[PDB]
């Protein structure tokens, strides 16, 4: 019934808060000014990047930025993995199915959650203490110029739905429990869990945004946009793996990308 679904929402929200250092709540405070904290160091060009090394943590520039984005994704994957293990029934699944779900879902969540840190002008980094501008990321030499821009385009549309952390906690869980990922061994228990999460998400969107009608339906349409940006992103990384040599992909990300789209 309704009560059980609310309890699911709340367990997931608590778990999200534990797993993810920087929430959409703080990110937005930081971005609108409303936090009393020291503003993030703005990185709008090659020099500001240089001066801002003291505020962030590890050859040419495009490559260095990409490898920084790389370090952070590994930590995202780790955080997302801990979050998944808190989704009731996830750890009882066939371990190979847990791996498949993460493998295909982690990037979809990375983009979803990256939108929390983004506006039309740029993205917060190093847990809110840098802000790297969109123009600066575009201005990178190709193929690194094209890397973040589809994430900004998506974020701009996604952020219009005005979801909060409590909504997002359930949405991310729904994404993880996708019964149609390639190579799953036992679909039914995954779909049983996702059916519950989807009900929990719908109730949540009615309660938390009663003025917003069909936010639930708008949100499901975006799960498909996410797969695109993930596919588009795998291909650009395919290009980068080939056309560049002075840079190794992190092992965890190798595990994730090989035999993926």
């Amino acid at each position: 019934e309704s009560a059980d679904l609310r309890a699911l929402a709340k367990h997931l929200y608590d778990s999200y808060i534990k797993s993810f250092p920087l929430t959409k709540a703080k990110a937005r405070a930081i971005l609108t000014g409303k936090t009393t904290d020291k503003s993030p160091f703005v990185i709008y060009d090659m020099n500001s990047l240089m001066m801002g090394e003291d505020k962030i943590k590890f050859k040419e520039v495009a490559i260095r930025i990409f490898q920084g984005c790389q370090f952070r994704s590994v930590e995202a994957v780790q955080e997302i993995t801990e979050y998944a293990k808190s989704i009731p029934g996830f750890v009882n699944l066939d371990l190979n199915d847990q791996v498949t779900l993460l493998k295909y879902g982690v990037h979809e969540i990375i983009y979803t959650m990256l939108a929390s840190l983004m506006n039309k002008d740029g993205v917060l980094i190093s847990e809110g203490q840098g802000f790297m501008t969109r123009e600066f990321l575009k201005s990178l030499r190709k193929p690194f110029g094209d890397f973040m821009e589809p994430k900004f385009e998506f974020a701009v549309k996604f952020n219009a739905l005005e979801l909060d952390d409590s909504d997002l906690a359930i949405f991310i869980a729904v994404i993880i429990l996708s019964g149609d990922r390639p190579g799953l061994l036992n679909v039914k228990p995954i779909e049983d869990i996702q059916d519950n999460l989807l009900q929990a998400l719908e109730l949540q969107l009615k309660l938390n945004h009663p003025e917003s009608s069909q936010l639930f339906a708008k949100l499901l349409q975006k799960m498909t946009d996410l797969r695109q940006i993930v596919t588009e992103h795998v291909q650009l990384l395919q290009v980068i793996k080939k056309t560049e040599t002075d840079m190794s992909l992190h092992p965890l990300l190798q595990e994730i990308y090989k035999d993926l789209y």
């Binding site: 994957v77 791996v99 595990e255």
Partner: peptide
């Protein structure tokens, strides 16, 4: 295969 992913899960 997926040794790290496996490791992160089994933790």
């Amino acid at each position: 295969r997926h040794k790290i992913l496996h490791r992160l899960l089994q933790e």
